[PDB]
Amino acid sequence: IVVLKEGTDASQGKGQIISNINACVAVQEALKPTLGPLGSDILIVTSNQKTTISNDGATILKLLDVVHPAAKTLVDISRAQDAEVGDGTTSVTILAGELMKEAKPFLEEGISSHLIMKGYRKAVSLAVEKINELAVDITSEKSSGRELLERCARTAMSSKLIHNNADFFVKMCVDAVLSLDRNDLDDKLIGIKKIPGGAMEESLFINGVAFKKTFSYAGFEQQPKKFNNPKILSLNVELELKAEKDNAEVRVEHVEDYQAIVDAEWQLIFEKLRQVEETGANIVLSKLPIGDLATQFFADRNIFCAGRVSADDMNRVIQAVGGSIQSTTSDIKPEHLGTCALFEEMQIGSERYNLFQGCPQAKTCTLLLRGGAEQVIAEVERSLHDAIMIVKRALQNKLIVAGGGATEMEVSKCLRDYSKTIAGKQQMIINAFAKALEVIPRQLCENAGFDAIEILNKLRLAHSKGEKWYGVVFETENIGDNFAKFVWEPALVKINALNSATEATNLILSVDETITNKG
Amino acid sequence: QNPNAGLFKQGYNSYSNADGQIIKSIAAIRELHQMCLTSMGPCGRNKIIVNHLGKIIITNDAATMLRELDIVHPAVKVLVMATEQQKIDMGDGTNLVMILAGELLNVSEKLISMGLSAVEIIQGYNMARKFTLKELDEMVVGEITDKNDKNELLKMIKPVISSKKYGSEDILSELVSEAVSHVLPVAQQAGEIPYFNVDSIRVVKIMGGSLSNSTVIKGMVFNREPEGHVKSLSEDKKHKVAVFTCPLDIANTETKGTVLLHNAQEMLDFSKGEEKQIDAMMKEIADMGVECIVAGAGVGELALHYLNRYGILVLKVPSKFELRRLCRVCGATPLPRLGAPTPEELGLVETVKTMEIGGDRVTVFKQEQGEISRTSTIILRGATQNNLDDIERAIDDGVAAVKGLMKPSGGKLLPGAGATEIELISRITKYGERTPGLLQLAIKQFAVAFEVVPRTLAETAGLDVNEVLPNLYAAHNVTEPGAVKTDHLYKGVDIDGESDEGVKDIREENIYDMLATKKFAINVATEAATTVLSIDQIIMAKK
């Protein structure tokens, strides 16, 4: 009748770690197909009834939100990779997963979880020393500031939808990053807009910012679309006379008074519109609608309006022109105004878009991507995103190591040789680590449709000849010098991704018991 | 058909010793024993706990394991309640009480099966306790001399950090020792003044990086930035600090004091009241020489305007508990009223500065070589939320253990890593052989229970206990030419991740346990096991 746990779940022992391993396998397998430039996509339907398709391990894991407590440890560590480093998210999940798979046969044979973790801690520490040793300090060596970044983006765009058009898209990626202050680069500084219709080769590059022109109200053939040096004012207040929700009941004894009240309401909004004119603004932008009367008033003043603009687009405009948003019209100051070098409205995609260009105060830029379908624009956007990342990292991280599995191959080799002098349980665990590292060149081959067995054999044998930059070639199925081919990753990504995968492996293998509090 | 008999209380599942309930109670405890058994030792195991709030905790802490379980059965409640006693009256010993109490019950299963009554078992255990406590007084080797130097604090802190965070001791030990030596004065030959308040060391955490970026602050850290224009104080000494709880705006009544405006003139006069009343209020604060104002509530636009004009540092502290602690350093008293800045309620601070930790701006209230705070802050860093929280617990153990170094006999040291328990097994057993009559049966088993410590230390490290244990006993099972056993009292249990024939010495790593912790924990464990063994019935009424 008396109980110990009142229905609270608790389980401990070797079987508990094996269960934790199985949970990690489910996570590893979920992301497995996304590895490599030819990786497959994952389709996730969220609880909010929104469907997404992506191969970005960071987006995938954040949407899956795997509940199993063991998975939460693995996923959270991969999340930290996304926050602390910005790349290697899939590598952390995959590397940790394979290690959990390797731990299983050792635990079953009665190998203590302490020695499994201890061998991993030593073997990984050795790997970090080797990855650091491989670091190449590269700046302008046999490559100009332009050639380095164009070669980086062009490489990223290989075997992509925009590979044959690299001559066009590479320029946008390199110009986009070089338009930024190298002292502080952030993905948020390069915006991308989607414009259905037309060919992808017709995309636009803007040194300032632009927005979709969400203002869809009346006002054809008015509000001048082009300004040389406009003053930009942003407001919160809605400038329409009548609301969609609010109103007033008017009841008086005279027809003159009935009209007087309607005119009074017109006068009240008129004074607010006049104050905007007194500001000396040329472009009037609002988070809320700017009404039919307001735009006719402003148009007769040769002032261009665009209302109902999203908070993100409004901020990017103000942040580009150097102005400020004011809630009211009576409190506006001249320091709220910004300026762009050019404002224009484009007819691209058979729809009107509002562009700013050459903004002298901007720290950002925008790409406007065109295409006949969401799948075309999305595929171009994803290819551009990866290209932007490698261009960004080319400026931020001078210490690089060969990619394509090349770094993993050298570490694995040095571990296989190191273990030759180790006796006891540590020998088996070090070798298991050396084997687990091969999951990367393996999955890179398999997801690409290559003969992974042949390529892995060629990589092992060719590497033993002293050429430490051999890796997976994705242009033609073979192996080659991925350093000379400009397929590289920052040394810090390899060190941090490995350390993160190691942490996730050790944290979960260290667990003997799970308790789930009920209530 | 089948009739019932023997149960006359109610429809129930009878729990009487007539059916071996004394064993069922122990068997029930075995479940929680096996849980905590995997925690103790530098190489202990982690446990995953899913909180009812959806928080996932992966920790070594045994108290968390027990506290987060909903427990009814009286047999385990005795041991869990005993554990909580260990948490309140001592800064350590959590695993020692739970594990030893279970093992004392485990060995009792043989004595009970032998036919030895619960009374006879308890009587022997009480005798063994009395022998054990006397031996602990005499097995002392080292002593902390209450000098509170860094080297002395580190000697104790190191083994305290171990068994929760192993391999991080080099960083964590420095974090605690620096915080303690800052707030813990050197004192001796006086017991009237208490030292080392539990609130003397605060721990805060910032996401990102790892423990290598941790540090120690000589004062209090607040998560808020200065809301005013002034972001820091000058280097001038003895800045006067005014502390308020009431929002800083137009003066009002402590209770309600809300002004309603209906007439045009009322709005005109009230608006003027705001500017005139706030200025005069801030004027008096400035005229007193106040350079920093600390509010438990918001500060209005005009209040910030005039506070800026007077050059007064404006810092909000939304936490009343943080203000209550600040009052212990700067001496200020918060004003619940608005417009009554009595000078008697002012405090002092030497420096208030805005600093960035990990990109997160915080405000520090600190001193350099004067009017020195008795409260310090330890800064923890980490990109992983779980490890960041778990390190905080490791620091808590470091701080809590130092509390045990105070006046009540915290000096005496015993060799750790199981060396104490191994010696106790030999000494308690010999007392058993000398003790006449049936008492020897339970006294000997009392000794047996203590092997769980050298056994757990080996097992958790991945060592074969069936080879380590006989070597541990052989090291202490020595005959010496004298009454006093010496020349090597340091033989402990290795926890190394690499093979090493034999055992290492305590003196090599300076792993010592506190006498007060060992005597108290064993005393508590004996009372816990004693109670459970005495139970021959569970009584309950239907709800």
Short mmCIF file of N, CA and C in Angstrom, two decimals, chain A residues 328-393:
data_model
loop_
_atom_site.label_atom_id
_atom_site.label_comp_id
_atom_site.label_asym_id
_atom_site.label_seq_id
_atom_site.Cartn_x
_atom_site.Cartn_y
_atom_site.Cartn_z
N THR A 328 4.32 59.62 -32.86
CA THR A 328 3.38 60.69 -33.15
C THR A 328 3.88 61.58 -34.28
N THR A 329 3.01 62.50 -34.72
CA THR A 329 3.35 63.48 -35.74
C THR A 329 3.67 64.85 -35.17
N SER A 330 3.23 65.15 -33.95
CA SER A 330 3.43 66.45 -33.33
C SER A 330 4.81 66.56 -32.68
N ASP A 331 5.44 65.42 -32.44
CA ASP A 331 6.71 65.34 -31.71
C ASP A 331 7.90 65.05 -32.61
N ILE A 332 7.74 65.14 -33.93
CA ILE A 332 8.80 64.79 -34.87
C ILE A 332 9.87 65.88 -34.84
N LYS A 333 11.14 65.47 -34.84
CA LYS A 333 12.39 66.22 -34.87
C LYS A 333 13.12 66.01 -36.20
N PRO A 334 13.87 67.01 -36.67
CA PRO A 334 14.66 66.81 -37.89
C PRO A 334 15.70 65.71 -37.79
N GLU A 335 16.15 65.35 -36.59
CA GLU A 335 17.11 64.25 -36.47
C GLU A 335 16.46 62.89 -36.64
N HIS A 336 15.14 62.84 -36.85
CA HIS A 336 14.49 61.56 -37.11
C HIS A 336 14.62 61.16 -38.58
N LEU A 337 15.04 62.08 -39.43
CA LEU A 337 15.09 61.85 -40.87
C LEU A 337 16.41 61.19 -41.26
N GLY A 338 16.33 60.27 -42.22
CA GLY A 338 17.51 59.70 -42.83
C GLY A 338 17.56 60.03 -44.31
N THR A 339 18.61 59.55 -44.96
CA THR A 339 18.79 59.79 -46.39
C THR A 339 19.42 58.57 -47.04
N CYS A 340 18.90 58.22 -48.22
CA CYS A 340 19.54 57.27 -49.11
C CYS A 340 20.05 57.98 -50.36
N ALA A 341 21.05 57.37 -51.00
CA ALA A 341 21.57 57.90 -52.26
C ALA A 341 20.57 57.80 -53.41
N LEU A 342 19.70 56.79 -53.40
CA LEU A 342 18.68 56.66 -54.42
C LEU A 342 17.52 55.86 -53.85
N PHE A 343 16.29 56.30 -54.15
CA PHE A 343 15.09 55.50 -53.94
C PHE A 343 14.43 55.23 -55.28
N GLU A 344 13.96 53.99 -55.45
CA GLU A 344 13.29 53.62 -56.69
C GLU A 344 12.30 52.49 -56.40
N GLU A 345 11.33 52.34 -57.29
CA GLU A 345 10.36 51.25 -57.24
C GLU A 345 10.52 50.43 -58.51
N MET A 346 10.75 49.13 -58.35
CA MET A 346 11.03 48.28 -59.49
C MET A 346 9.82 47.41 -59.83
N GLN A 347 9.74 47.02 -61.10
CA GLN A 347 8.66 46.22 -61.65
C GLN A 347 9.08 44.77 -61.82
N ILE A 348 10.20 44.40 -61.18
CA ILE A 348 10.75 43.05 -61.27
C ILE A 348 9.72 42.04 -60.81
N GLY A 349 9.64 40.91 -61.50
CA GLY A 349 8.73 39.84 -61.12
C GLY A 349 7.28 40.14 -61.40
N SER A 350 7.00 41.20 -62.16
CA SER A 350 5.64 41.65 -62.45
C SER A 350 4.92 42.07 -61.16
N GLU A 351 5.71 42.55 -60.20
CA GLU A 351 5.18 43.13 -58.98
C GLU A 351 6.08 44.26 -58.50
N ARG A 352 5.49 45.26 -57.84
CA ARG A 352 6.23 46.44 -57.43
C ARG A 352 6.96 46.19 -56.12
N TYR A 353 8.23 46.57 -56.07
CA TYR A 353 9.06 46.45 -54.87
C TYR A 353 9.68 47.81 -54.57
N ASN A 354 9.82 48.13 -53.28
CA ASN A 354 10.37 49.42 -52.90
C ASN A 354 11.83 49.27 -52.51
N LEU A 355 12.72 49.90 -53.29
CA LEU A 355 14.15 49.74 -53.09
C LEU A 355 14.75 51.03 -52.54
N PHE A 356 15.72 50.88 -51.65
CA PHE A 356 16.68 51.93 -51.32
C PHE A 356 18.02 51.45 -51.88
N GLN A 357 18.84 52.40 -52.32
CA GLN A 357 20.14 52.06 -52.90
C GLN A 357 21.20 53.05 -52.47
N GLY A 358 22.42 52.55 -52.28
CA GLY A 358 23.55 53.40 -51.96
C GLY A 358 23.42 54.17 -50.66
N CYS A 359 22.75 53.59 -49.66
CA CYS A 359 22.53 54.28 -48.40
C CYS A 359 23.86 54.54 -47.70
N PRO A 360 24.22 55.80 -47.45
CA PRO A 360 25.56 56.08 -46.91
C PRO A 360 25.73 55.68 -45.46
N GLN A 361 24.63 55.46 -44.73
CA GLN A 361 24.67 55.11 -43.32
C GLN A 361 24.52 53.62 -43.07
N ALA A 362 24.33 52.83 -44.13
CA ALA A 362 23.98 51.43 -44.00
C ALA A 362 25.19 50.60 -43.59
N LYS A 363 24.95 49.58 -42.77
CA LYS A 363 25.93 48.54 -42.49
C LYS A 363 25.50 47.19 -43.05
N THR A 364 24.48 47.18 -43.90
CA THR A 364 23.85 45.94 -44.34
C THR A 364 23.78 45.95 -45.86
N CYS A 365 23.36 44.83 -46.44
CA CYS A 365 22.97 44.75 -47.84
C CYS A 365 21.86 43.73 -48.02
N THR A 366 21.26 43.74 -49.21
CA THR A 366 20.14 42.87 -49.53
C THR A 366 20.33 42.28 -50.92
N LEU A 367 20.02 41.00 -51.07
CA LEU A 367 19.90 40.36 -52.38
C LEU A 367 18.43 40.14 -52.69
N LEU A 368 18.05 40.40 -53.93
CA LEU A 368 16.69 40.15 -54.40
C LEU A 368 16.69 39.01 -55.41
N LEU A 369 16.21 37.85 -54.99
CA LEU A 369 16.33 36.62 -55.76
C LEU A 369 15.02 36.35 -56.49
N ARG A 370 15.11 36.13 -57.80
CA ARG A 370 13.95 35.87 -58.64
C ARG A 370 13.92 34.41 -59.05
N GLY A 371 12.73 33.92 -59.35
CA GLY A 371 12.58 32.59 -59.91
C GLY A 371 11.12 32.21 -59.99
N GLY A 372 10.86 31.23 -60.86
CA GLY A 372 9.51 30.83 -61.20
C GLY A 372 8.76 30.07 -60.13
N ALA A 373 9.44 29.63 -59.06
CA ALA A 373 8.80 28.83 -58.03
C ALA A 373 9.54 29.01 -56.72
N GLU A 374 8.85 28.76 -55.61
CA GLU A 374 9.49 28.69 -54.31
C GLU A 374 10.66 27.71 -54.27
N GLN A 375 10.56 26.58 -54.97
CA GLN A 375 11.65 25.61 -55.04
C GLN A 375 12.88 26.15 -55.76
N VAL A 376 12.68 26.96 -56.80
CA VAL A 376 13.81 27.57 -57.50
C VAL A 376 14.49 28.60 -56.60
N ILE A 377 13.71 29.53 -56.04
CA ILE A 377 14.27 30.59 -55.21
C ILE A 377 14.90 30.00 -53.95
N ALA A 378 14.21 29.04 -53.33
CA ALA A 378 14.75 28.41 -52.12
C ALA A 378 16.07 27.71 -52.41
N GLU A 379 16.15 26.99 -53.54
CA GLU A 379 17.38 26.28 -53.87
C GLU A 379 18.52 27.26 -54.15
N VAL A 380 18.21 28.37 -54.82
CA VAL A 380 19.22 29.41 -55.03
C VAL A 380 19.61 30.04 -53.69
N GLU A 381 18.61 30.33 -52.85
CA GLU A 381 18.89 30.93 -51.55
C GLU A 381 19.79 30.03 -50.71
N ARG A 382 19.49 28.73 -50.68
CA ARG A 382 20.31 27.81 -49.90
C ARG A 382 21.73 27.74 -50.43
N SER A 383 21.89 27.70 -51.76
CA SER A 383 23.23 27.70 -52.33
C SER A 383 23.96 29.00 -52.04
N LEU A 384 23.27 30.14 -52.14
CA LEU A 384 23.88 31.42 -51.80
C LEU A 384 24.25 31.49 -50.33
N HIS A 385 23.39 30.96 -49.45
CA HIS A 385 23.67 30.99 -48.02
C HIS A 385 24.99 30.30 -47.69
N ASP A 386 25.17 29.07 -48.18
CA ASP A 386 26.43 28.37 -47.95
C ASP A 386 27.60 29.13 -48.56
N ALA A 387 27.42 29.69 -49.75
CA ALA A 387 28.47 30.49 -50.37
C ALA A 387 28.80 31.73 -49.54
N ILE A 388 27.77 32.39 -48.99
CA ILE A 388 28.02 33.55 -48.14
C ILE A 388 28.82 33.15 -46.90
N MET A 389 28.49 32.00 -46.31
CA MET A 389 29.20 31.56 -45.11
C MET A 389 30.69 31.38 -45.36
N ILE A 390 31.06 30.69 -46.45
CA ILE A 390 32.47 30.43 -46.70
C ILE A 390 33.20 31.71 -47.09
N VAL A 391 32.50 32.63 -47.75
CA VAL A 391 33.08 33.94 -48.03
C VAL A 391 33.30 34.71 -46.73
N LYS A 392 32.31 34.70 -45.84
CA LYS A 392 32.47 35.34 -44.54
C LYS A 392 33.64 34.74 -43.77
N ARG A 393 33.68 33.42 -43.65
CA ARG A 393 34.75 32.76 -42.90
C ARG A 393 36.12 32.96 -43.51
#
